[PDB]
Write a protein that binds this DNA or RNA. Sequence first.
RNA 1: CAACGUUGAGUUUGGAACCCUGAACAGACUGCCGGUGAUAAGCCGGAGGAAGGUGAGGAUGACGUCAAGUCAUCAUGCCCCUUAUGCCCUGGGCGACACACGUGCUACAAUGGCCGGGACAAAGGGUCGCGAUCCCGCGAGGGUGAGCUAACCCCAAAAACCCGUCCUCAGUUCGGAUUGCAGGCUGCAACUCGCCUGCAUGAAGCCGGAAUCGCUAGUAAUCGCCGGUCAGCCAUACGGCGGUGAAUU
Lengths: 97, 40, 11, 144, 116, 78, 110, 99, 216, 154
Amino acid sequence: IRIKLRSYWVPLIEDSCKQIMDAARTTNAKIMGPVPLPTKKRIYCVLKSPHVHKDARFHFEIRTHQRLIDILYPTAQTIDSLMQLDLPAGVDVEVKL
Amino acid sequence: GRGDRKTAKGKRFNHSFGNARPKNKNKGRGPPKAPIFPKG
Amino acid sequence: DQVEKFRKKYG
Amino acid sequence: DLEKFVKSRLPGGFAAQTVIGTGRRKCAIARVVLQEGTGKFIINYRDAKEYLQGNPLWLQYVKTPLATLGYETNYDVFVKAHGGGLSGQAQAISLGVARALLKVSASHRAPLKQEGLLTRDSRIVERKKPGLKKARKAPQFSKR
Amino acid sequence: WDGPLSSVKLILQGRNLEVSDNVRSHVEDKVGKSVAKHSHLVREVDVRLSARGGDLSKGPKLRRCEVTLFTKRHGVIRAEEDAESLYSSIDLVSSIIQRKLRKIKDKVSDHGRHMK
Amino acid sequence: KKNPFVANHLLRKIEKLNKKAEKEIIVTWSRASTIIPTMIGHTIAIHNGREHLPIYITDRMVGHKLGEFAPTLNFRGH
Amino acid sequence: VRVGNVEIPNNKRVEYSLQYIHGIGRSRARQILCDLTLENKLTKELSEDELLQVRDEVTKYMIEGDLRRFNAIAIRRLKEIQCYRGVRHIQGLPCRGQRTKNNCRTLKRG
Amino acid sequence: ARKSLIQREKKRRNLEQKYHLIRRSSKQEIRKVTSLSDKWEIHGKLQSPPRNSAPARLHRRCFLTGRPRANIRDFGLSGHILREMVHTCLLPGATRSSW
Amino acid sequence: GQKINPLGFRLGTTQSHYSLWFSQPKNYAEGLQEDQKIRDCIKNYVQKNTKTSSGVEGIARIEIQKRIDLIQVIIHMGFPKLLIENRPQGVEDLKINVQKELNCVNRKLNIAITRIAKPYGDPNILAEFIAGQLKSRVSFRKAMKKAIELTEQADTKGIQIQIAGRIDGKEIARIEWIREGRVPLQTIRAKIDYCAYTVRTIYGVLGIKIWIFMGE
Amino acid sequence: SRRGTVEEKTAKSDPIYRNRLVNMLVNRILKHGKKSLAYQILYRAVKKIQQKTETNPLSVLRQAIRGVTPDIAVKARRVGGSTHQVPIEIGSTQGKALAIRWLLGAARKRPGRNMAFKLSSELVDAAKGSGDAVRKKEETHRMAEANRAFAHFR
RNA sequence: CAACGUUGAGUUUGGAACCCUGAACAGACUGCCGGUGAUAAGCCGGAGGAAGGUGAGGAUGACGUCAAGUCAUCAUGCCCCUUAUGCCCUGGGCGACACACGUGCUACAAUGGCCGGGACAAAGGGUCGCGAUCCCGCGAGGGUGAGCUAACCCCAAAAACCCGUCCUCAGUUCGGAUUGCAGGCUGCAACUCGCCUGCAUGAAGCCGGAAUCGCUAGUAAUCGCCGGUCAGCCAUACGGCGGUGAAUU
Ligand SMILES: [Mg+2]
Ligand SMILES: [Mg+2]
Ligand SMILES: [Mg+2]
Ligand SMILES: [Mg+2]
Ligand SMILES: [Mg+2]
Ligand SMILES: [Mg+2]
Ligand SMILES: [Mg+2]
Ligand SMILES: [Mg+2]
Ligand SMILES: [Mg+2]
Ligand SMILES: [Mg+2]
Ligand SMILES: [Mg+2]
Ligand SMILES: [Mg+2]
Ligand SMILES: [Mg+2]
Ligand SMILES: [Mg+2]
Ligand SMILES: [Mg+2]
Ligand SMILES: [Mg+2]
Ligand SMILES: [Mg+2]
Ligand SMILES: [Mg+2]
Ligand SMILES: [Mg+2]
Ligand SMILES: [Mg+2]
Ligand SMILES: [Mg+2]
Ligand SMILES: [Mg+2]
Ligand SMILES: [Mg+2]
Ligand SMILES: [Mg+2]
Ligand SMILES: [Mg+2]
Ligand SMILES: [Mg+2]
Ligand SMILES: [Mg+2]
Ligand SMILES: [Mg+2]
Ligand SMILES: [Mg+2]
């Protein structure tokens, strides 16, 4: 089983990863690590003022960080220990089986 | 020339890849400029 | 001839 | 042909070998494997003069780290590169060579620092700033 | 308007207002006097008219004239006037231009012995 | 190989007026639609945005649109 | 050589010489040359055999007189039509949907 | 802006929903099926549904104000409100960014 | 000159976000929309049900976290004596309306109210307070000074208060402001709580900005 | 430059001949930063100059520049309300600069076919003291000496 | 990284040794040495070091000024319209044209233009989407539709540059305006007013008066690539990304 975490803020995502990795390390299944994928980062620029001045611009991004987690062998206890998991409200998880 | 839609340059500037500036090696370019025969 | 010219295109 | 000379001279990939150095400058990265004997410059499975085009300049950057030494006929260089343009890749080659050389014998240090071949050129491209045409270029401007 | 000033660009722009024939002629006269004497230096005359007050907006009936001159060598001659009538305004701007102008002629065109 | 164009309403009007064989003025707004042979000799009044302009259709017209014959811009002189 | 349609390519490569006929651009040029006739040289170095072929081919494509009267009857027709483009031709203002407020100068010089 | 504009937009959305599949259908019909003098009639079907039914007719407006210009799609917000909201931290993941 | 909303200036440093969820770029617009709809609802409700019973209702902020199953609304609030004490506790009475708005398909909603202990160490509340006293046609001097008092006795290191508009119904508008203690606006390490509020008087609008500095 | 002065930059060497001089010339002949092309031009110039004459081009450089190096020029000063042409003397770096420049300009204005040919032609003419680049320097000296009376620092 | 063979590759092995990704951590402080300086802050130098004196760029903009700009983003005091100054629709119009003023792009050629054959990026975006392969077309495109919710697949051709062949001084193989013919695509609809292709057409224009602007290093210059808006676009614009790379104080 591979899980793709994607989330905005960092601490949340690696603590979430930490929960998953320890809750699968406990149930005795082998893990291929929390592999970082390249951070996809989107830029938008906008007009600062409501009118006229074309030069005052505002740059904001959205950074999205991707973690990969490869669990090797899917024990019943492993699948349940990771299906149980409480992952904070700001992370997304994808499960490829 | 960059303003010539009849040239590889001009096509490249106008973002129109067309007869002069072909998409692949199998699309027909203009009739050939191949023969010259200098011997000497 | 613009009528037949038009009919050669479409018909 | 040259691919078999590179492959047969080097079984262990690019990572294993004792003497390796890594150049990077601008967007170009070059990994460098140093070996003993003859002298041959193979870059990405093609010749030095083939690749670098024989712009005297670039070639000279590449060979320069071995001319402070004189090891021109003593070493064999195999590098792989990507990113950027060939000028940069050349510069990179230059640096990675220097690091490899400092890996083989540390005594080389003093020549290489006196020439200044050891430092990472930090100069890179500056980003484009809003309201400006490119970098520091400000649009044509009328006082009236 | 003038021929000796033919080398000069008279640019007359109403901002919020409509320009008449009497404003035309009057502008040509009052700016004409100021410019005509110093014409060798002068280049472009930019006159904008702004009206406010009365029935248009709040506040007194202000009419405000802004002029700008340019010379072959020195840039930026700016003059701003507020008054009752367009006519009054113009008369004022002329009064100011004249002074600044002959101040420039004074500086450079005096063979001023500037030692330093 | 792709159809030319004409407005539906226009097309069927021209059909009816062709069948019943009378020349009647047609007020139309379709400033796009093409003049197809079967409308020739008719008089069509096209919208210029304020007025309808009567135009007599001829052999030459076919292949163009309607709006070429109703100038939209009123300009004579500075 | 003259006889190529009453006009004179002079002392150059054949293609860029052929072009001097109003009616031949680059395409017809290198097509006629490098497809039908097959030979590329200077102009005066053209052997009679080649020259004949050249004339006969170029004679089947339109040329200065025929083209000029072709486009002229085009324009004329449009003007008679009283359509938009006609109006513009007649008036001397640009028809391809280019703005008149500023730069027409090429077509406005007339 | 005017409330009426926003309403115009809404009624457009509705009509386009209603006729959506019909549009795709008549469309593949004129695309796939030959005979010019047939395509007259299927183009006669085409021209029947209201003009306010064509996707081309739609216009995105910032969902908060409704300003017709300057809408970046990801947010459905106009530049200005987007800015304000980025400062009160309502946009998850938004950061004043300097690269 | 213009400053930056000192909120937005420390983002991913000394300040968190408010909406805590994630979405794929396409859904992101929709999700945003949804947050807005409920923040609106929950503001309205409380406004009308507390100002009917005549009290000062600090609604300090609204945090929303979306999880695939349940979406959770955390209301930071200064005095929930007006939301709890009423018979239909704000919890249920709101849970129903908010769950009407967003959707109930694949999303069920939970509301939780949190008591922000020191109400005058929160700018937002304080500003609503001054807003009340000024809506009451108290002179702005008194208002400012009372606010400063309340706050500094409520545990605060620094405060800067600014009020702009037609002050005292006088025809020409102006800008009055008071700094108290220490307010670094440029230090990113400083925990800074800012807020912006608007007031509708007989004479037109009045802006209030409040800066509050809680240490490093 | 009101405050800071300028640090010195590493004087490079031309790859083939290992000269500071030749390198100077290839940098000033450069346009649109194509170094690739500039080297080609300069070397086909060395090749035409070894073609026409059997003398060592390395030396014809030294003659070409010794030939066009001005030791003095003027500068416009504002002194006591009077605008003077005061004959300021020139530093060596500045001399080499000026030199290579007048060379290059007179080389760009030539009637010829290539740039290699032009550059070679003007190197030949300047080494002989026979050309515009030299004449130019002598004019600068003529207009320095006429104004010799206005250098009060003399 | 290496291997097996293939241009479709595989998921087919090992390695984690290079690279890369991204998280944590270390590092630069005039910290050390010498010289200067009232002792002081510092200033010139030297070492080590990838970096040395804000290492380089960015976000950051005090009290205030201009009763600056914006009641057409939003909000709002007051004033005014309320079978109309509000609302629905189809056509027009914002795209006019004696001119003037400002910003840009292309140019005026051999440091070049054309052709043929080779090589090297970055960062982006992409499920009503990006679309390989194959087939029809000289060509835009048309038919087909893998693979891809993206370090996987696609847009994708990087271009300058280089090795060859032609022109070696022309109003030309410069430059490409204008206009005609015949097409393609989007979209109910391309006449006013879209963009793109093929054939033809081949204006001005030989570096530009007075004046005037941008720039101190990865900068200027020069070369292309992407994005947002978006059915399609007027984009040469704006915001970004890398390639090559100066002179001067
Ligand atoms: Mg050309
Ligand atoms: Mg285009
Ligand atoms: Mg094409
Ligand atoms: Mg084909
Ligand atoms: Mg960068
Ligand atoms: Mg750049
Ligand atoms: Mg601009
Ligand atoms: Mg740009
Ligand atoms: Mg409104
Ligand atoms: Mg639209
Ligand atoms: Mg301020
Ligand atoms: Mg000093
Ligand atoms: Mg493996
Ligand atoms: Mg040091
Ligand atoms: Mg710094
Ligand atoms: Mg004002
Ligand atoms: Mg105004
Ligand atoms: Mg209003
Ligand atoms: Mg109206
Ligand atoms: Mg309408
Ligand atoms: Mg406009
Ligand atoms: Mg129009
Ligand atoms: Mg432009
Ligand atoms: Mg796009
Ligand atoms: Mg296709
Ligand atoms: Mg001419
Ligand atoms: Mg010429
Ligand atoms: Mg300047
Ligand atoms: Mg688009």
